[PDB]
Design a protein around this ligand. Sequence first.
Ligand SMILES: NC(=[NH2+])NCCC[C@H](N)C(=O)O
Length: 238
Amino acid sequence: ALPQTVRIGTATTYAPFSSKDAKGEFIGFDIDLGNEMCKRMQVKCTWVASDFDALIPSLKAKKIDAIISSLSITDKRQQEIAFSDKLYAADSRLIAAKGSPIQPTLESLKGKHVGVLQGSTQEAYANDNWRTKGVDVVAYANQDLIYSDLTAGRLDAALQDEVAASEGFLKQPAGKEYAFAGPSVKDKKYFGDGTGVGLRKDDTELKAAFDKALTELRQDGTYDKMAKKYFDFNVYGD
Ligand SMILES: NC(=[NH2+])NCCC[C@H](N)C(=O)O
């Protein structure tokens, strides 16, 4: 009962997982994973670009059938939607100017301007722990605006997925004079357990098909072959 075309939403401003190349075509590990799973599921797949915070609403409105967009598997989201098995791990961490004393603490961030992606686990954490207590937490439509507001000095720091920041910004020319500010933020309730394909709860058959494809491409070594294009480490985690 799988649709002839699985529509997959993604927010294409989160390299190296999802972004656009020079032609405007979808590139990144999420795209590679989704395309490889779709190949093995024997379905066609059409990618649909969207602001990150629109993904879960579009899914619930059936405007898309799946979300592959570094979507963290959280307790809160599982009350709304279902997930495939984990695609890869995702920790959260702050970035700031090289030499910044900033730590992911209320004390260190008071009077600071901190960027977070609207609709993200990072916004949830920052709004609850930081924004209410005086920290200027600013929500953004997409992560590229955040990077730009950081390098323009409009933001003192930004919270996002650690691997995204590292490969998508810090190790790029634009992020040369920036670094991680403090260690990963550990809060399993807000940040969840890796990312997965977001799905409607009643699409059990579609979930089983994604799950089957994922295990097979991991088993035969395709996952690691695809991952090496982007990462010299175990992006999957535990
Ligand atoms: N393509 C993106 N913009 N992904 C943002 C993901 C951020 C975080 N992992 C979350 O699920 O909220």
